[PDB]
C-alpha cells in the first residue's frame, strides 16, 4: 500500500531518489493441486541473498542505465534468458532510503514460465545473489491458511510484498476482497506464532 | 527444540503415530557473497504447496514402506535424482497430530547440490507439490539480520525449522551460540514487523 505516482512524475525524481525495477512474471495455470484445488495463476518470486522473498530485479542507477536496460541487466544475471520492455511497465511507487520502485509485469505461458525457472538454475547469480525461485500459491486450502495466506506469512522485501498484492489486484488475478482476506489470515497466523 | 528419541524407541511407536522423513542436503561452500562474506555451507530447503518452507520429504506410511524407501519415494517425486540410505539417518523427534519426525542428512559436493537443484526443476512434483528449492544463507550481514536471521523470519513447517537448527548444531555447521543469536534476531524482527 505504497503511494503510487505517475511514470513522468517518477522521472522528475532524479539524484535525490534511488530507483528500483522489478519483474512480475506470471502465467495462467489450468492445473489443479491434488487434482482438486484450481491453481488459477502462477507467479514467480525468489529467495534473495539476504534471506527475504522478493521479485527478480534490483536497483537501477540512472546515471548509467535506462530503467528498461538496467532491469534487463539484472534479469540477465539472475534469470538469464528473458528481456522486458516498456510494454511490460505497470506501476511506480514511493517507499531508510528515498526509493521509487518500478514494477514491470508480463504474462507468460506456463511452459515459458517453466523455461524461466530452468534458465534461472543455470544463471550467473544462482547460489550467490539469488538463492532460488519459488512459485506463489494463489489458492487457499480448507484450513484457510494453507497456500496463499501461509505464503504471505514469509519475510519479504517490504516493497515486494506491496507490489505483489497491488499487481494481483490491478491485473485482476484476485479480487481485492480476497487479497485483504488472505493478508489478514497471514498477519494473524504471524501473531499467533509469536507466542513462545 | 523437539523431544529427541532413539531410533528404536521411535520404531515402537506404530499405529498410534504417524511418521515423517525429511532430507537435509548440504555442501561446504568456499565461495564468498559479494566477494566479501564467507558462505561456509549451503543447505537446501523448499517452498511447499502450502506456502511454507520445509525440507524435501513427507509422511511415510509404515504399513506400506520402510522409512528409507518411503523417503526415497518422495525424494524421487520432488528432487528426481538422488537416494538416501540409513547411512544418512541423523535423528528422530516427537512433535494437531502424533508425529515422529525422522531427519536424514547428507553432505554433498557443491556441484552435486547444484545437480539436485537442476533435477528438481524437472521433477514430477515441481510446480505442484513443490514450488521451488531455496538455499539457506548461513552468513549474517553487517546489519545483523541480512542473511540467516532474515531467512529464519520466514514461515516454516514448524518441525522443519526445529530440524534445521538442530542439524546445524549437531553437524557442527554453526555453534549453538550463533544459532540462538540468529533465531533471536529473527523473532525480534518479526515482532518489530507486527507494528501496523
Amino acid at each position: 500500500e505504497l503511494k503510487q505516482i505517475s511514470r513522468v512524475e517518477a522521472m522528475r525524481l532524479g539524484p535525490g531518489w534511488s530507483h528500483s525495477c522489478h519483474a512480475m512474471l506470471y502465467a495462467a495455470n489450468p492445473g489443479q493441486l491434488f487434482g482438486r484445488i484450481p491453481m488459477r495463476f502462477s507467479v514467480l518470486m525468489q529467495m534473495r541473498f539476504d534471506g527475504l522473498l522478493g521479485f527478480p530485479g534490483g536497483f537501477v542507477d540512472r546515471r548509467f542505465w535506462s530503467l528498461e536496460d538496467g532491469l534487463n541487466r539484472v534479469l540477465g544475471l539472475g534469470l538469464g534468458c528473458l528481456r522486458l520492455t516498456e510494454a511490460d511497465y505497470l506501476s511506480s511507487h514511493l517507499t531508510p532510503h528515498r526509493v521509487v520502485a518500478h514494477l514491470y509485469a508480463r504474462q507468460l505461458t506456463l511452459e515459458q514460465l517453466h523455461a524461466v525457472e530452468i534458465s534461472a538454475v543455470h544463471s550467473r547469480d544462482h547460489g550467490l545473489e539469488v538463492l532460488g525461485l519459488v512459485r506463489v500459491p494463489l489458492y487457499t486450502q480448507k484450513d484457510r491458511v494453507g497456500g496463499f495466506p501461509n505464503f504471505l506469512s514469509n519475510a519479504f522485501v517490504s516493497t515486494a510484498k506491496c507490489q505483489l498484492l497491488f499487481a494481483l489486484k490491478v491485473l485482476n488475478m484476485m479480487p481485492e476482497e480476497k487479497l485483504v482476506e488472505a493478508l489478514a489470515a497471514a498477519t494473524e497466523k504471524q501473531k499467533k506464532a509469536l507466542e513462545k | 527444540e523437539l523431544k529427541q528419541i532413539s531410533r528404536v524407541e521411535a520404531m515402537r511407536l506404530g499405529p498410534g503415530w504417524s511418521h515423517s522423513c525429511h532430507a537435509m542436503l548440504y555442501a561446504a561452500n568456499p565461495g564468498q557473497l559479494f566477494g566479501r562474506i564467507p558462505m561456509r555451507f549451503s543447505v537446501l530447503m523448499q517452498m511447499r504447496f502450502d506456502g511454507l518452507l520445509g525440507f524435501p520429504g513427507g509422511f511415510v506410511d509404515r504399513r506400506f514402506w520402510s522409512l528409507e524407501d518411503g523417503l526415497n519415494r518422495v525424494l524421487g517425486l520432488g528432487l528426481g535424482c538422488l537416494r538416501l540410505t540409513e547411512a544418512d539417518y541423523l535423528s528422530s523427534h516427537l512433535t494437531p497430530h502424533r508425529v515422529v519426525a525422522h531427519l536424514y542428512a547428507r553432505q554433498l559436493t557443491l556441484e552435486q547440490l547444484h545437480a539436485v537443484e537442476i533435477s528438481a526443476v524437472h521433477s514430477r512434483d515441481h510446480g505442484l507439490e513443490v514450488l521451488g528449492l531455496v538455499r539457506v544463507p548461513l552468513y549474517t550481514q553487517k546489519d545483523r539480520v541480512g542473511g540467516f536471521p532474515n531467512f529464519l523470519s520466514n514461515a516454516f513447517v514448524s518441525t522443519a525449522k526445529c530440524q534445521l537448527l538442530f542439524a546445524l548444531k549437531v553437524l557442527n555447521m554453526m555453534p549453538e551460540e550463533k544459532l540462538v543469536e540468529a533465531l533471536a534476531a529473527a523473532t525480534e524482527k518479526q515482532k518489530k514487523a507486527l507494528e501496523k
Epitope: 534511488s18 528500483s20 538496467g70 541487466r73 544475471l77 532510503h97 547469480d125 545473489e129 | 566477494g35
Partner: nanobody
Framework: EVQLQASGGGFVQPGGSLRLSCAAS????????MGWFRQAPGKEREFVSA?????????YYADSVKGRFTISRDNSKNTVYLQMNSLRAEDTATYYC???????????WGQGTQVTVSS
C-alpha cells in the same frame, strides 16, 4: 558505505595524454558499474564514460570523447581506468569517479580530480 579512491590528473599540454584510475572499497558487490563524469567551466556535470564489471554491455562514451578516451577495468582490484588521449582545451574539468550496483540503493561519487589542458 562504498568509498572511491582516485589517482591521476593535473596539468597537461594540448594533444598529450593522461590516465585516471579509480577503485571502490567497502560494501562493494560482484556485479557493479563504474564510470566518470566531469564538470567543465560554465557547464553542468556531464557523462564521460561508464563500464560494467560483468560484460553486461559494451562500455559507452560521450560523443565528444569517442575515439580519444578509453575506459578499462581490473576487477581483481575493483579498479577502473580512463585513458585520456589527444587532450584538448575542452577537456579541462573536474573529473569524478562513480560507483553503483544493482544490490544497494546508493549511487556513490568520488572526490573531484582536476585535469587542466593548457600550453
Amino acid at each position: 558505505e562504498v568509498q572511491l579512491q582516485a589517482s591521476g590528473g593535473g596539468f597537461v599540454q594540448p594533444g598529450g595524454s593522461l590516465r585516471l584510475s579509480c577503485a571502490a572499497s567497502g560494501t562493494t558487490s560482484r556485479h557493479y558499474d563504474m564510470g566518470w563524469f566531469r564538470q567543465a567551466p560554465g557547464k553542468e556535470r556531464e557523462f564521460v564514460s561508464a563500464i560494467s564489471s560483468d560484460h553486461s554491455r559494451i562500455p559507452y562514451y560521450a560523443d565528444s570523447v569517442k575515439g580519444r578516451f578509453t575506459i578499462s577495468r581490473d576487477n581483481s582490484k575493483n579498479t577502473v581506468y580512463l585513458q585520456m588521449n589527444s587532450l584538448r582545451a575542452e577537456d579541462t574539468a573536474t573529473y569524478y569517479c562513480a560507483y553503483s550496483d544493482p544490490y544497494q540503493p546508493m549511487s556513490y561519487w568520488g572526490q573531484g580530480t582536476q585535469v587542466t589542458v593548457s600550453s
